[PDB]
Ligand binder design. Structure first.
Ligand SMILES: *[C@@H]1O[C@H](CO)[C@@H](O[C@@H]2O[C@H](CO)[C@@H](O[C@@H]3O[C@H](CO[C@@H]4O[C@H](CO)[C@@H](O)[C@H](O)[C@H]4NC(C)=O)[C@@H](O)[C@H](O)[C@H]3NC(C)=O)[C@H](O)[C@H]2NC(C)=O)[C@H](O)[C@H]1NC(C)=O
Ligand SMILES: *[C@@H]1O[C@H](CO[C@@H]2O[C@H](CO)[C@@H](O)[C@H](O)[C@H]2NC(C)=O)[C@@H](O[C@@H]2O[C@H](CO)[C@@H](O)[C@H](O)[C@H]2NC(C)=O)[C@H](O)[C@H]1NC(C)=O
Ligand SMILES: *[C@@H]1O[C@H](CO)[C@@H](O)[C@H](O)[C@H]1NC(C)=O
Ligand SMILES: *[C@@H]1O[C@H](CO)[C@@H](O)[C@H](O)[C@H]1NC(C)=O
Ligand SMILES: O=[N+]([O-])c1ccc(OP(=O)(O)O)cc1
Ligand SMILES: O=[N+]([O-])c1ccc(OP(=O)(O)O)cc1
Ligand SMILES: [Mg+2]
Ligand SMILES: [Mg+2]
Ligand SMILES: [Mg+2]
Ligand SMILES: [Mg+2]
Ligand SMILES: [Mg+2]
Ligand SMILES: [Mg+2]
Ligand SMILES: [Zn+2]
Ligand SMILES: [Zn+2]
Ligand SMILES: [Zn+2]
Ligand SMILES: [Zn+2]
Lengths: 486, 484
């Protein structure tokens, strides 16, 4: 599609002139930040960002690539180098330590330096590193963790846990030697390492004794509590302070959000991961944007400020399943959660960063026409005379081999919710990509997010901006009425 | 490999503290720019940048991903939205119009608005758009075009040409109707549309009459001149001004660079594209960094300043051939050309941008170990019990069906110069990717390169910084002694 207005050079010259006016008037905010917000698109590399822009644009009735995402409005951009100390193509755990603790680490370990060794419980002790969230709490700020995966997953675990094995969700996942050597399962670390004001996401089963029926799936033994120590970790967390509340559904969450007696909130919406947004039960399950709204409303009450971590954790899982429809629809919802927080916070006192922990081997090509579906076919058949989708994965479960016969997929099949795009190599799960990811920033000290940075830099910018340890001697003025003129 | 120094959190905390010190001390340069430099990595998307960082790092004796590229030192970063008006997965021609002219355009057309139509000669007239290079020349600056492809290719052509078909290199490539309707081949537009001080790259054959033996390959008919109008476009370009010089090899280039009688230089080093750097004859063929040095030295002589376009054009071609070794080695040389220009220019008076026109369907994964070759294998076998390379392409000539028998490639085979990584879909040539690309900037007005921008913004920033049309009323102070 050739939009007529774009045929005129005046359209492009005017757009560029307006962008130059925005750039020339752009001002940095030179105060500290009262609030610190980190939005993490799990697996949301640069290809995912563009494909999400096209999808969100088209859902809104536009052609796609021209339509800005909520993240595209952020004034400051940088590239983030994602490598783990031991692996150049990283995982979620090792990356979590970098952007949440400010120290690069080893693949599959959380909140520990690279002196630690994967699955070696004894290597934990003396090697723990502390999160910006932990440090925000020590400074008197309120702290929050919001995710679409289990709250015990690698990314949210990076804000509170210290483990040499990211698979240790409950005591049921641990070898006896690790339990005896003094290692704690992630679910236990969640309630005991530090005070967390807001915990929202999935992961009910790892918090309850073995056989405890799930409130949503009581008849399914696979959804039941799994704990071997018979501890009710939800009960133990509630008992820590006055004003705590536990919710497991959307109605309870909405009621809790309005309740003045509630000051701390734990909301666990599924036995493990939350349903993909497209499969969400709108009456039972809250959306990521709803969870972020409740989190901001509760955390906002503390006049000292807050640190908030929001994770679009299922973008990663959609890509692992080679199902681009799931990965991209999750990213659409992630972008809406960014928009909601923007409506509820001011850049004058809030530093908001948007980034990814790593990328995937996801790409879209085939010289597709303007305004066509991202899930569509390339305009020409491939060398074998059969069609090909714009989206293709390097590896994963989408690999097809009907003997030596490549399928000849239709537009109807390719746009299907459960369609797995073709891949070059078979794997039960598609792999991460090792390439750099974007960092978007808005608010006090956002101008420090520039150039090409090591991933661990994200944690240091946020700690510096909030005058948190090791930067208590920040030398920054408190937030006032300095804005971007954006 | 776990490097011992990286086990200590103090290493990471010190590195971040140093980066914060650089960021806090970073000062925008609020003057105009005397010199405007654009480095274009053709097809160099974000995956190519990282893979090139690892490769360049390892070639230098390091582990790889920790080692900065010359481009990684640029203070200002942004994302560029590459879509063509008619195609969301773009080509080199349509993108060239955006970052060189400041107007987005249609797929396969150069220096024309999207009112024009591909391969419709009549749609050219009244729809031409003018480059920042053309506008730099009008303002009295010296102008230069440096590329590793033929100088008549889509990207360099964007600085001087207006065509509805990027395949019109010479008159031999044109239909008779287009010639009769008044359309000009790219090679002719090169010498006639504007005055270009420095032209460096390939493309000898499109400049000479049919059958003119190539100076390097006289015995090969496939390397001979291709022109049907019997014009010698090199001779016509030399005759335009006093002090012009034509070179076709490295020794002649070096001699021309030092000759005070030479003020304009045309250097065409191959019949078509220049050899891939790994295949380069070091005595006969100049490197991209050498061409960049000669261009900067010659263009620097003008007290009014210069506009210079430098293109790592074979990065794209390596990826099209599904041969990552070629694509990445070209990008290594591209990064070295960035470094050379940095040594020869001052950020106080020079605005240098680095970007890509578009990306590819190239990626690298497989949870590879730190310090391993980018051309290596993933540490574990795939689901079918056979190995897999870290690098994989979505499509292209690397596809291997083999009656459903996926190869079980070795490290020796995968690291080979001509190895084509596996692909999901067969194509004679691998396709571009539609995702955003990076923009890196240094110098006066580099701080305007921020956030997420439309690709055509690159041309406007450069025109504004140089006080070129339509921004002659820039209101900027002249370059001074303020650095980043
Ligand atoms: C999204 O979340 C929804 C909210 O929880 C969830 O809805 C629940 O779904 C099931 C239907 O699959 C309901 O249980 C079945 O539905 C009937 C319940 O009505 C009942 O009427 C009887 C009248 O005397 C009485 O015996 C019964 O106790 C009363 N229940 C209630 C809750 O007031 C019943 O006819 C049916 O047999 C029962 N049994 C089966 C399948 O054997 C349940 O009520 C729903 N809860 C709510 C609040 O609506 C929904 O399924 C979930 N998923 C989707 C896709 O929407
Ligand atoms: C790489 O090229 C070297 C230089 O090539 C010579 O110079 C020009 C430059 O393009 C070219 O036109 C000629 O084909 C070539 N010919 C001649 C007669 O010099 C080649 O090296 C040699 O150059 C030396 C002087 O530097 C000369 O004495 C040699 O005779 C010439 N080699 C010959 C004639 O065989 C060199 O061969 C080449 N290397 C490879 C591997 O191709
Ligand atoms: C695949 O089906 C398409 C119809 O969309 C057809 O045009 C094409 O010829 C087919 N390719 C084959 C059967 O090789
Ligand atoms: C491929 O060769 C490797 C040797 O590295 C071997 O381990 C593997 O079993 C082979 N795969 C098959 C299926 O032949
Ligand atoms: O996101 N991860 O770290 C992750 C999870 C499951 C995997 O398989 C591979 C990587
Ligand atoms: O425009 N291009 O760079 C381009 C488009 C299709 C190709 O094949 C090769 C090159
Ligand atoms: Mg995660
Ligand atoms: Mg639920
Ligand atoms: Mg606001
Ligand atoms: Mg090109
Ligand atoms: Mg040569
Ligand atoms: Mg310099
Ligand atoms: Zn991840
Ligand atoms: Zn993952
Ligand atoms: Zn290109
Ligand atoms: Zn190309």
């Amino acid at each position: 599609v050739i939009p007529v207005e774009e045929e005129n050079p005046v359209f492009w010259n005017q757009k560029a002139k307006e962008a130059l006016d925005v750039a020339k008037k752009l001002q940095p905010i030179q105060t500290s930040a009262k609030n610190l917000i980190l939005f993490l698109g799990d697996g949301m590399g640069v290809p995912t960002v563009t494909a999400t822009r096209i999808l969100k644009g088209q859902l809104g009735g536009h052609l796609g690539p021209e339509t800005p995402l909520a993240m595209d409005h952020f004034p400051f951009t940088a590239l983030s180098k994602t490598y783990n100390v031991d692996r150049q193509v990283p995982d979620s755990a090792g990356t979590a330590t970098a952007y949440l603790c400010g120290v690069k680490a080893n693949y599959k370990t959380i909140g520990v330096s690279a002196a630690a060794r994967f699955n070696q419980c004894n290597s934990t002790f003396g090697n723990e590193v502390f999160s910006v969230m932990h440090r925000a709490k020590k400074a008197g700020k309120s702290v929050g963790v919001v995710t679409t995966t289990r709250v015990q997953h690698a990314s949210p675990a990076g804000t509170y846990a210290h483990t040499v094995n990211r698979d240790w969700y409950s005591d049921a996942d641990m070898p006896s030697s690790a339990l005896q050597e003094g290692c704690k399962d992630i679910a236990t670390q969640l309630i005991s390492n530090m005070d967390i004001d807001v915990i929202l996401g999935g992961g009910r089963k790892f918090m309850f004794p073995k056989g405890t029926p799930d409130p949503e799936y009581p008849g399914d033994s696979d959804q039941s509590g799994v704990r071997l120590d018979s501890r009710n970790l939800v009960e133990e967390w509630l008992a820590k302070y006055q004003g705590t509340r536990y919710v497991w559904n959307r109605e309870q969450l909405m009621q809790a959000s309005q309740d003045p007696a509630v000051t701390r909130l734990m909301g666990l919406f599924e036995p493990t991961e939350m349903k993909y947004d497209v499969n969400r039960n709108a009456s039972a399950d809250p959306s990521l944007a709803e969870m972020t709204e409740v989190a901001v409303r509760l955390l906002s009450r503390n006049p000292q400020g807050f640190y908030l971590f929001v994770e679009g954790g299922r973008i990663d899982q959609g890509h692992h399943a080679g199902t681009a429809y799931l990965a991209l629809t999750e990213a659409v919802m992630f972008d809406s959660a960014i928009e909601k927080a923007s409506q509820l916070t001011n850049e004058k006192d809030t530093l908001t960063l948007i980034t990814a922990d790593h990328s995937h081997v996801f790409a879209f090509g085939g010289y597709t026409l303007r305004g066509t579906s991202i899930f569509g076919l390339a305009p020409l058949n491939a060398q074998d005379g059969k069609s090909y989708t714009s989206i293709l994965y390097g590896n994963g479960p989408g690999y097809v081999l009907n003997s030596g016969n490549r399928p000849n997929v239709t537009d109807a099949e390719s746009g299907d919710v459960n369609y797995k795009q073709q891949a070059a190599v078979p794997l039960s799960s598609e792999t991460h990509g090792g390439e750099d990811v974007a960092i978007f920033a808005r608010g006090p000290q956002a101008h420090l997010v520039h150039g090409v940075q090591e991933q661990n830099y994200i944690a240091h910018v946020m700690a510096f901006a909030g005058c948190l340890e090791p930067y208590t001697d920040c030398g920054l003025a408190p937030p006032a009425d300095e804005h971007h003129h954006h």
